[PDB]
Design a protein around this ligand. Structure first.
Ligand SMILES: *[C@@H]1O[C@H](CO)[C@@H](O[C@@H]2O[C@H](CO)[C@@H](O[C@@H]3O[C@H](CO[C@H]4O[C@H](CO[C@H]5O[C@H](CO)[C@@H](O)[C@H](O)[C@@H]5O[C@H]5O[C@H](CO)[C@@H](O)[C@H](O)[C@@H]5O)[C@@H](O)[C@H](O[C@H]5O[C@H](CO)[C@@H](O)[C@H](O)[C@@H]5O)[C@@H]4O)[C@@H](O)[C@H](O[C@H]4O[C@H](CO)[C@@H](O)[C@H](O)[C@@H]4O[C@H]4O[C@H](CO)[C@@H](O)[C@H](O)[C@@H]4O[C@H]4O[C@H](CO)[C@@H](O)[C@H](O)[C@@H]4O)[C@@H]3O)[C@H](O)[C@H]2NC(C)=O)[C@H](O)[C@H]1NC(C)=O
Ligand SMILES: *[C@@H]1O[C@H](CO)[C@@H](O[C@@H]2O[C@H](CO)[C@@H](O[C@@H]3O[C@H](CO[C@H]4O[C@H](CO)[C@@H](O)[C@H](O)[C@@H]4O)[C@@H](O)[C@H](O[C@H]4O[C@H](CO)[C@@H](O)[C@H](O)[C@@H]4O)[C@@H]3O)[C@H](O)[C@H]2NC(C)=O)[C@H](O)[C@H]1NC(C)=O
Ligand code: Q3G
Ligand code: Q3G
Ligand code: PTY
Ligand code: PTY
Ligand SMILES: *[C@@H]1O[C@H](CO)[C@@H](O[C@@H]2O[C@H](CO)[C@@H](O)[C@H](O)[C@H]2NC(C)=O)[C@H](O)[C@H]1NC(C)=O
Ligand code: A1ADG
Lengths: 106, 80, 104, 333, 168, 60
């Protein structure tokens, strides 16, 4: 089992500032790391597939960066419709997900 | 002995473990080295006490062939 | 191969300029002295067939062999001679010299 | 669906035995080269290996179509059905395309009839290495290609602005040499068939003197200093200065044999074997000096006494001077 | 997937595999590339047996010369000369097996240090012979000091070298 | 060469020892060299017998 550690657990930030979410892999997972956005009472929505490949319909402000074991999701000009849980999941092996990051407005 | 080994190894693959021929050549090399070291030991005590030097030479004459024969018998019964 | 001499004829176009590029060839060990172009007919059990022969005369360069193998022999022979200037009393020295020269 | 119709219309009534513009004007071909790697450079055979992607583009007004499709992107299936230039490499000992899993070939035809044709090639290119100053030798040797049967009146090649592109150079197989740059050239050569446009790419390679240093130079100088050691031994008829000398000589000749076997059998004198010969002269000089000293022991003791120290001082100074002269002359060339 | 019995490696060991997927830019466009990495680990037994043990034996043989009496000059001269020739032959042979890389490997450093030890033993014998019959006490002192110094330094070097190239 | 050592004086031990050892070494080198030309057959050829007898004479 590959356990993925997501940090920070929760971070409250203001509009229009660069916010970066980090994911750490227990073992090697080449670039099969995905980032999903889950709004309250909504199913997860795929944002980044592979490492640094925006999914169709994802605004160009969502940027993914990856490595063999260290990955980051970078949001640029943040907006107010980005308040959602963000999960990172690996797919190199049988899929596992991180705890997630609860974005907050402040 | 080193020449024999070098000529032999130029016709085999680079293998990690020790082959039986390698074991035999190493044992023979150890025997030759022990003969040289025995001579050096004799020369170290030549002047101070030639009696024990002569005793050591006699003991070597007696016990190098015997140990070599024992090693050969062990080697040729281990594999064959 | 198949066509006998009454079916096909071979000849050099130019008869002396048919072959070019010989003088530009450099060989590490040989020098092209010259080359000839020959026209002839050869007889086999199945008939007589046209033949063209191109031949090169190659002369071997000597300097490389001089350096690699000749000098050492003269030098070892001289080092063996050196034994005569050693006094007969030094048996080990002279015998070592001679044996080592033979081994070399 | 309708790409099949376009392809069928293109090939109907098409003769691939005739170059485009057969009796009008020469076919102009623009060539590009991507160099994946420059392989080992073995001086024994005076050749080097190179792996490239070779792109060729030309205009064929017969391959002209009108549709919403602007470019036809095809695999190697259709390569053999159209006219292809017969480009060959003139200084290649041998070369081969790649065929796994399918022929590594690409064909693209544009709306206006422009054709792009790319294939992957590995080439063993001949170049004659002048091994003077070896191992301090630098070479820039070519890769030439032209049409085999089409003279200048029929096919003309032309380098693009960014024609030759190299990769990283960190993953290449150059051990003795380092890649320092390249350049392209064009010219016309005369042959029994006619005048041919010949294109050339020159790769600049400089040998790096790190392997040969530790392989030949250090052992030879170490043997020389070992020969020097004799001058301090007890001065008598001892075999400690005779066996020493002769063993030094045999080791020197063995080292010379190996070192010369390193490289091809060239009749001229290289920089390396001049050094070996000088180190071979120094050891002989030491041995003969000892011989003369021993001979003079019986005649004059003071002569030998002062001769020992004179050699002890004259040898290292001469060797250092020779080293300085040799390295200054060869490095600044 | 690698077959269980499908190993034709004799000098290496296959630790595992690793795949990846990526994109490469090219002058003709943008292409997908699928990558696999096979992680290999060289086995050391052959090089031990064929280079390291010969060098250690040669160094030991060179150091044996310190126990010969100062009167047997040709004996020690032969020891030194033959040990140096052996070290040179070993250096050539051990460099033969490798690609002609332009840098120095760990084996190269080990061979160079062993070569230095043999040469230093020869130099020590030369110094002893130089100071023999003129300052015998000094020659005896340096000889009996070398008898302990050389093995100790060689052992320390071997320990350091192996600890630094194996704990990695 | 090995038999030439007989004519040396008995008061020269190093010289005759060198003769014997170097002759034996040369015989060993020759024996190693000779087979290198032939395939690795499992029996002894005439050349093998000749080399064996020469080695026996040197050793004797
Ligand atoms: C003296 O005798 C010698 C021995 O007989 C002789 O050498 C032989 O020369 C002939 C003629 O040149 C060679 O035959 C040609 O081979 C070309 C490929 O060359 C490379 O590959 C072969 C092996 O070929 C296999 O693999 C390729 C691709 O992988 C296939 O395309 C082949 O059909 C063949 O596939 C079979 O075998 C595979 C196993 O290998 C199987 O997996 C597979 O399923 C098949 O069963 C190598 O041997 C070559 O190496 C040799 O040659 C090189 C030359 O540089 C040397 O360096 C090297 O050292 C070796 O000597 C080389 O690596 C073929 O491309 C070629 O066939 C095409 O051309 C002819 C003529 O134009 C067409 O009729 C033919 O149909 C092919 O054209 C179609 O395919 C091409 C593909 O690009 C299309 O572009 C083209 O448009 C056309 O498409 C049409 O047909 C397709 C079906 O074919 C269809 O799919 C399309 O949709 C479309 O309809 C030809 O067969 C032969 O290999 C040599 N043999 C040897 C041992 O060297 C020598 O010349 C003689 N000397 C003299 C002076 O006479
Ligand atoms: C390398 O090795 C090859 C192979 O051995 C040599 O090839 C020989 O080359 C020489 C010189 O080129 C050839 O000599 C020539 O032979 C011709 C054939 O003679 C036969 O036929 C004529 C009538 O057709 C008869 O008179 C004769 O008896 C033979 O039966 C001659 O025609 C040549 O000229 C001779 O005749 C004319 C006219 O009379 C005279 O003016 C000439 O001076 C000369 O006498 C000539 O003799 C020889 O045949 C070749 N041998 C083979 C087997 O082909 C190469 O020479 C050699 N060297 C090089 C550098 O390649
Ligand atoms: C191998 C070693 C390689 C070659 C060895 C050469 C040695 C020279 C010959 C011995 C010699 O000089 O003589 C022996 C003895 C008898 O004296 P002798 O009456 O003159 O008889 C000899 C006379 N017939 C003749 O022609 O030689 O002299 C002694 O000093 C006796 C003490 C030691 C004897 C050796 C046995 C121990 C090892 C014996 C070996 C053990 C064999 C076991 C092997 C399986
Ligand atoms: C490819 C590269 C090849 C390059 C080859 C070049 C290699 C260079 C390497 C060259 C160095 C050569 C090594 C040593 C040779 C002779 C030393 C020697 O003995 O002569 C000095 C003498 C003067 O002092 P004294 O006589 O004691 O005076 C008495 C009283 N007044 C007092 O001082 O108490 O005695 C000493 O000092 C003894 C200590 C040295 C020997 C033991 C350790 C050295 C080896 C241990 C160290 C050797 C290790 C080798 C290197 C790691
Ligand atoms: C003076 C006495 C004679 C000289 C002694 C010979 C030295 C032998 C040194 C070889 C080293 C050795 O034994 O290595 C092992 C071979 O095992 C073996 O198979 C060796 C032990 C058994 C061999 C059979 C008989 C040999 C001769 C015994 C006679 C000695 C007593 C007298 C392990 O090697 P490895 O590297 O494969 O291990 C794990 C590899 N991954
Ligand atoms: C005749 C001479 C008598 C010696 C007896 C023969 C020794 C045989 C050598 C064993 C070779 C061998 O297979 O062992 C390696 C151990 O590697 C290792 O890890 C061993 C590396 C250690 C280097 C050698 C240490 C000796 C130096 C000590 C200094 C002496 C100073 C004295 C003044 C193989 O390893 P593998 O990679 O196949 O793995 C799998 C198994 N192990
Ligand atoms: C490769 O060949 C091309 C075409 O001959 C060269 O392009 C010329 O480069 C020079 C600069 O050296 C310019 O002044 C010309 O205007 C270029 N001509 C064209 C048609 O682009 C190019 O220099 C060559 N590459 C080299 C020499 O490295
Ligand atoms: C003789 C032998 C057999 C198998 C493996 C190694 C060796 N071996 C040894 C044990 N010692 C040497 C000392 C110097 C030069 C070469 C060797 C050598 O080849």
């Amino acid at each position: 089992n590959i356990v993925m550690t997501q940090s920070p657990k929760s971070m409250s930030m203001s509009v229009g500032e660069r916010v970066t979410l980090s994911c750490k892999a227990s073992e090697y997972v080449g670039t099969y790391v995905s980032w999903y956005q889950q709004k309250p009472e909504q199913s997860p929505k795929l944002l980044i597939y592979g490492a640094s490949n925006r999914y169709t319909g994802v605004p160009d402000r969502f940027t993914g960066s990856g490595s063999a074991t260290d990955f980051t999701l970078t949001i640029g000009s943040v907006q107010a419709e980005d308040l959602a849980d963000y999960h990172c999941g690996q797919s190199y092996s049988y899929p596992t997900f991180g705890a997630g990051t609860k974005l907050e407005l402040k | 002995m080193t020449t024999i080994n070098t000529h032999l190894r130029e016709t085999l693959p680079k293998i990690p473990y020790v082959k039986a021929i390698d074991m035999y050549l190493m044992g023979c090399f150890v025997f030759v080295f022990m003969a040289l070291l025995e001579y050096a030991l004799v020369n170290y005590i030549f002047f101070s006490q030639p009696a024990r030097a002569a005793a050591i030479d006699r003991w070597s004459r007696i016990f190098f062939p015997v140990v070599f024969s024992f090693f050969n018998i062990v080697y040729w019964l281990y594999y064959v | 191969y198949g066509y006998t001499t009454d079916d096909i004829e071979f000849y050099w176009r130019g008869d002396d300029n048919a072959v070019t590029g010989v003088t530009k060839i450099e060989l590490p060990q040989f020098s092209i002295v010259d080359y000839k172009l020959i026209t002839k007919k050869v007889v086999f059990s199945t008939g007589s067939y046209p033949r063209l022969s191109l031949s090169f005369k190659l002369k071997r360069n000597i300097g490389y062999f001089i350096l690699q193998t000749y000098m050492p022999s003269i030098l070892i022979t001289i080092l063996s001679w050196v034994s005569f200037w050693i006094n007969y009393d030094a048996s080990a020295a002279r015998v070592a010299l001679g044996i080592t020269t033979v081994l070399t | 669906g309708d790409v099949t119709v376009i392809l069928n219309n293109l090939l109907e009534g098409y003769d691939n035995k005739l170059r485009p513009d057969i009796g009008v004007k020469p076919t102009l071909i623009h060539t590009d080269m991507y160099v994946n790697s420059i392989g080992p450079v073995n001086a024994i055979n005076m050749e080097y290996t190179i792996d490239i992607f070779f792109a060729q583009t030309w205009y064929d007004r017969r391959l002209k179509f009108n549709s919403t499709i602007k470019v036809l992107r095809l695999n190697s299936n259709m390569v053999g059905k159209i006219w292809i230039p017969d480009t060959f490499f003139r200084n290649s000992k041998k070369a081969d395309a790649h065929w796994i899993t399918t022929p590594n070939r690409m064909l693209r035809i544009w709306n206006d009839g422009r054709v792009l044709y790319t294939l992957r090639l590995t080439i063993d290119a001949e170049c004659q290495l002048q091994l003077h100053n070896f191992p301090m030798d630098e070479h820039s040797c070519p890769l030439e290609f032209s049409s085999y049967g089409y003279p200048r009146e029929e096919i003309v090649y032309q380098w693009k602005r960014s024609s030759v592109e190299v990769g990283d150079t960190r993953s290449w197989r150059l051990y003795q040499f380092s890649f320092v740059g390249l350049r392209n050239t064009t010219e016309v050569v005369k042959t029994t068939s006619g005048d041919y446009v010949v294109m050339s790419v020159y790769f600049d390679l400089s040998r790096r003197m790190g392997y040969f240093t530790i392989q030949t130079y250090i052992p030879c100088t170490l043997i020389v200093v070992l020969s020097w050691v004799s001058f301090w031994i007890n001065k008598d008829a001892v075999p400690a200065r005779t066996s020493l000398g002769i063993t030094t000589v045999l080791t020197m000749t063995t080292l010379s044999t190996i070192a010369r076997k390193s490289l091809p059998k060239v009749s001229y004198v290289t920089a390396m074997d001049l050094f070996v010969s000088v180190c071979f002269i120094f050891v002989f000089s030491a041995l003969v000096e000892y011989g003369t000293l021993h001979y003079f022991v019986s005649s004059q003791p003071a002569r030998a006494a002062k001769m020992d120290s004179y050699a002890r001082i004259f040898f290292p100074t001469a060797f250092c001077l020779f080293n300085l002269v040799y390295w200054v002359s060869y490095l600044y060339l | 997937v690698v077959a269980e019995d499908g190993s034709r490696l004799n000098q290496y060991d296959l630790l595992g595999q690793t795949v990846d997927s990526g994109i490469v830019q090219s002058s003709t466009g943008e292409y997908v590339v699928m990558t696999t990495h096979f992680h290999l680990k060289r086995k050391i037994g052959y090089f031990v047996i064929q280079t390291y043990l010969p060098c250690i034996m040669t160094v030991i043989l060179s150091q044996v010369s310190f126990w010969l009496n100062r009167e047997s000059v040709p004996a020690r001269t032969v020891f030194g000369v033959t040990t140096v020739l052996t070290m040179t032959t070993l250096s050539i042979s051990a460099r033969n097996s490798l690609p002609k890389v332009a840098y120095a490997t760990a084996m190269d450093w080990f061979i160079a240090v062993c070569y230095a030890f043999v040469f230093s033993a020869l130099i020590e014998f030369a110094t002893v012979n130089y100071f023999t019959k003129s300052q015998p006490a000094r020659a005896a002192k340096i000889d009996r000091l070398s008898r302990i110094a050389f093995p100790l330094l060689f052992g320390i070097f071997n320990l350091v070298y192996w600890a630094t190239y194996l704990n990695r």
